[PDB]
């Protein structure tokens, strides 16, 4: 929910975004999306990626949001795809709002952050 796609209340184009992705009940504020926001700023699709190939990436971070680690937690079976996104994660290296949380909440959520890289609008 960033850049030009917030929600259904978003007059971007003809986008019937009635059923959006996961919401925040307990926690995971505007933060996961930030992480994600960041990751794509840093991320880079490969010629190998398909319109729904995906990587679970387990990150590790400091109470600053500074990414201390990041690996492929669950591979798409495409190391470029998987890793390009690792290099998406690692390149951000520090996320903003992690310092706005309870250390306990950060530990819960963003201590290790899991980013699922699952494309949109490929060539194929």
């Amino acid at each position: 929910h960033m850049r030009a796609l917030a929600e259904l209340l978003s007059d971007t184009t003809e986008r019937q975004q009635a059923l959006a992705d996961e919401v925040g009940s307990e926690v995971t504020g505007s933060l996961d999306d930030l992480i994600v926001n960041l990751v794509s700023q840093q991320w880079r699709r490969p010629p190998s990626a398909r319109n729904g190939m995906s990587v679970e990436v387990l990150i590790e971070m400091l109470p600053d949001g500074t990414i201390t680690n990041a690996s492929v937690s669950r591979s798409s079976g495409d190391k470029p795809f998987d890793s390009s996104a690792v290099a998406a994660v690692r390149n951000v290296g520090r996320i903003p709002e992690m310092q706005q949380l309870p250390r306990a909440t950060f530990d819960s959520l963003y201590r290790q952050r899991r980013i699922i890289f699952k494309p949109e609008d490929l060539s194929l």
Binding site: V27, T28, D32, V36, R44, I115
Partner: peptide, 13 residues
């Protein structure tokens, strides 16, 4: 936290 679906990356086409 719940793994968030990042579909975006470089501002490619």
């Amino acid at each position: 936290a719940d793994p968030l679906v990042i579909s975006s990356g470089n501002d490619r086409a």
